[PDB]
Amino acid sequence: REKKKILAERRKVLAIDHLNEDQLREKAKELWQSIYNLEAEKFDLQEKFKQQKYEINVLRNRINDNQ
Amino acid sequence: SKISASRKLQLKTLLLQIAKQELEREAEERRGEKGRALSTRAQPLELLGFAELQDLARQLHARVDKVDEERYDIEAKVTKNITEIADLTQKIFDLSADAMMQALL
Amino acid sequence: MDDIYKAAVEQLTEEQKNEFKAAFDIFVLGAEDGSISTKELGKVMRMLGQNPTPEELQEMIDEVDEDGSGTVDFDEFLVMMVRSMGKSEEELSDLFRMFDKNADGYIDLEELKIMLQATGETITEDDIEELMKDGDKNNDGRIDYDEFLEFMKGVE
Ligand SMILES: [Ca+2]
Ligand SMILES: [Ca+2]
Ligand SMILES: [Ca+2]
Structure with a gap:
């Protein structure tokens, strides 16, 4: 029984657990659209992280060799 | 050469x-x-039963709250990389004709 | 950035080299050594709608003085002409990764040879030699990021 845990799970109840079946139709759609868009942001953020490890490593080679 | x-x-x-x-x-x-x-x-997505259609919309709502946290954790890693890249790059940086041809010929 | 001008000098049409030789022979009208000293470069500059200083005048002579005789001869004059007739560093960095295939951070000879064969043009033993010792300006068999920038100066 956590205060911040009980309140967190209530976000579903306040947003979903109360209304229409025809609105739940066009509401579960936009809930997946948000995941897909965030899953796309997460892919691009992972790819940029790969390129930075190369960018940083090349810098570590330059800073050393130029001393 | x-x-x-x-x-x-x-x-x-x-x-x-x-x-x-x-x-x-x-x-x-x-x-x-x-x-x-x-x-x-x-x-x-693809379809349901109005009752047990909801517990998936509840599961989607919980997914968004986790996906965006995973997206934040990788974003903050890209953010800290930007700080070090600019810091590393800072360290290393320290270490007429045609007007004549016409006015002549 | 130097051997990019000699290429433009080499590819000058003999009808362009004629106009330059003609304009060069008016340039040097009245010079003892038959070459552009500071008097000759002085007149044609102040009369070209300018007025450089005697010191500032020499740095245009010495910018292409591969002779040291303080006088721009005709061959140096062609280099001077093509100097007044590239690739951004941020863009050359993105391509530096395409060479570095093993992703170590340098461009060894093997990675250079693979790119050269991928050009479709016929590569020779002397093309590979001269290119590597042109980019590798300290003879370590590799081209670090700083040299690769100097290596691709002004390349289209
Ligand atoms: Ca000379
Ligand atoms: Ca390499
Ligand atoms: Ca080198």
Whole structure:
């Protein structure tokens, strides 16, 4: 029984657990659209992280060799 | 020099000419890699029973709160990399004719 | 950035080299050594709608003085002409990764040879030699990021 845990799970109840079946139709759609868009942001953020490890490593080679 | 500087320059231009193509080829590979990673991580929606249709919409709502946290954790890693990249780059940086031809001839 | 001008000098049409030789022979009208000293470069500059200083005048002579005789001869004059007739660093960095295939951070000889064969043009033993010792300006068999920038100066 956590205060911040009980309140967190209530976000579903306040947003979903109360209304229409025809609105739940066009509401579960936009809930997946948000995941897909965030899953796309997460892919691009992972790819940029790969390129930075190369960018940083090349810098570590330059800073050393130029001393 | 063993070869003419005109050939030396022609070869240098063709090296970047394909290195650009390998980059655009790399972008097309990354575009296809994303769509495949999105059909796996974001299996598209398809239908239900009005009662047990809801516990999936509840499951989607809980997914958004976790996906955005995973997106934040990787974002903050990219953010800290930007700080170090600019910091590392800071450290290393420390270490007429045609108007004449007409007015002459 | 130097051997990019000699290429433009080499590819000058003999009808362009004629106009330059003609304009060069008016340039040097009245010079003892038959070459552009500071008097000759002085007149044609102040009369070209300018007025450089005697010191500032020499740095245009010495910018293409591969002779040291304080006088721009005709061959140096062609280099001077093509100097007044590239690639951004941020863009050359993105291509530096395409060469570095093993992703170590340098461009060894093997990675250079693979790119050269991928150009479709016929590569020779002397093309590979001169190119590597042109980019590798300290003879370590590799081209780090700083040299690769100097290596691709002004390349289209
Ligand atoms: Ca000279
Ligand atoms: Ca390498
Ligand atoms: Ca080197």
